[PDB]
């Protein structure tokens, strides 16, 4: 998964 | 393997001073620990070892802090080892997270040309941006921050808004979601504003208070879903989220999935940490140029750190929305160090928000399949 403060996409 | 690691590459070194921020040292009262920015050993090492030791892909993020406050030529530095070193031929992905104060034209296009993600901090219009995010002067920072846009989208760089939900925010979502849907902004994450850890909560003119989300994540859902039924596609973060967790029984944002994981957080002296919220001596894993990855995931501290996060509270066990929310993120269930995780302190805005949102929420699900 991605970190909440950071860019993510899908 | 795949590995994703979140780089703190000028530490908590910032030129703003965001009201709400406890990533910064702010002031005599509010201090962040400051490594400076990160030598070219310990770049050189932490790039060689993700890419040693990661399979499949890997993801470096840089955030901080400022993490253009390394400079552009850490940044050059940095694809020149990941062209050198990535014997594996992995696939790699690179981000970054700024305050866009210091974008400039060659920052723009080095970001467009290596593919770069880019998070640009946006907290709304005008005033709403200026309320909270000030300058080191206590001056106003949103043209600068609309100047990065600009820069953004005339040099093609992919980004998305990120924007913290304060009491504010919850009084003029129309406002805020008019001004993005206005500059053509259509990837949002909104961040709930965090009272810093272990403060009793609510204390601050810009804390977002459960009633405040509530008022918010309603308001929210409703300008989107009109959007939506009008053919307009806008990303917000958490409602993907929550259409992942509906299609898939699972969702890409941590903190959606019930569980915390290792963020693999590396600060500027190469020392590791479990998650960006929890960079605090007692969660220090180890550092990056002494221990594999796998190492430090298996630490005594890395494991009690996860597992932590597997406690589900009695109220989340009878609650119709369980397999939705699954309680939350860990940050917004630790009230007191130490002491077992609580109820998340949103629990009653997640509650709230279901019941008003979950019809509709179907309804897109159903139409993106
Ligand atoms: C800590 S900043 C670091 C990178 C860069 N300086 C920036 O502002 O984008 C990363 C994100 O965290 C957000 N943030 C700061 N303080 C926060 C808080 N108290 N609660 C939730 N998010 C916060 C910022 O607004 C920003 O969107
Ligand atoms: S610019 Fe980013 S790191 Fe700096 S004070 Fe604001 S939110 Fe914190
Ligand atoms: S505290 Fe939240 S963001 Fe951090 S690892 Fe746990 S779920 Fe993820
Ligand atoms: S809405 Fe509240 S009770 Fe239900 S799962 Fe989420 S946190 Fe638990
Ligand atoms: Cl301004
Ligand atoms: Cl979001």
């Not at chain 2, 050059?76 to 034209?105: A, C, F, P, V, W």
Request: charged share 25%; hydrophobic share 35%.
């Amino acid at each position: 998964t991605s970190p909440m403060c950071a860019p993510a996409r899908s | 393997p795949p590995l994703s690691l979140l780089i703190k590459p000028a530490s908590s070194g910032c030129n703003l001073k965001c009201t709400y921020c406890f990533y910064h040292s702010l002031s005599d009262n509010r201090n962040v620990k400051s490594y400076g920015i990160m030598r070219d050993e310990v770049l050189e090492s932490m790039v060689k070892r993700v890419l040693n030791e990661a399979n499949g892909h890997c993801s470096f993020a840089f955030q901080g802090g400022e993490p253009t406050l390394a400079g552009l030529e850490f940044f050059e530095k940095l694809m020149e080892l990941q062209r050198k070193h990535n014997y594996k031929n992995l696939k790699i992905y690179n981000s970054l997270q700024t305050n866009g104060t210091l974008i400039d034209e060659s920052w723009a296009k080095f970001l467009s040309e290596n593919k770069f993600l880019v998070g640009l901090s946006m907290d709304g219009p005008k005033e709403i941006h200026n309320l909270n995010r000030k300058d080191c002067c206590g001056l106003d920072t949103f043209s600068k921050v609309e100047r990065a846009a600009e820069l953004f989208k005339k040099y093609k760089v992919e980004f998305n808004i990120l924007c913290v939900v304060t009491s504010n925010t919850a009084r003029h979502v129309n406002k805020v979601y008019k001004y993005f849907k206005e500059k053509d902004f259509k990837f949002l994450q909104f961040i709930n504003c965090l009272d810093p850890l272990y403060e009793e909560k609510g204390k601050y003119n810009y804390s977002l208070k459960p009633k405040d989300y509530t008022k918010f994540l309603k308001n929210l859902f409703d300008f989107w879903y009109e959007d939506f039924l009008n053919g307009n596609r806008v990303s917000i973060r958490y409602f993907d989220g929550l259409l992942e967790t509906i299609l898939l029984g699972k969702s890409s944002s941590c903190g959606m999935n019930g569980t915390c994981t290792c963020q693999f957080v590396v600060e500027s002296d190469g020392s590791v940490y479990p998650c960006d919220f929890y960079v605090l001596d007692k969660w220090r894993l180890g550092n990056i140029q002494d221990m594999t990855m796998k190492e430090l995931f298996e630490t005594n501290k890395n494991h009690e750190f996860i597992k932590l996060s597997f406690k589900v509270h009695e109220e989340c066990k009878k609650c119709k929305w369980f397999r939705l929310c699954k309680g939350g993120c860990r940050r917004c269930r630790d009230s007191k160090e130490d002491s077992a995780l609580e109820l998340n302190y949103y629990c009653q805005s997640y509650k709230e928000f279901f019941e008003y949102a979950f019809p509709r929420l179907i309804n897109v699900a159903n139409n993106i399949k």
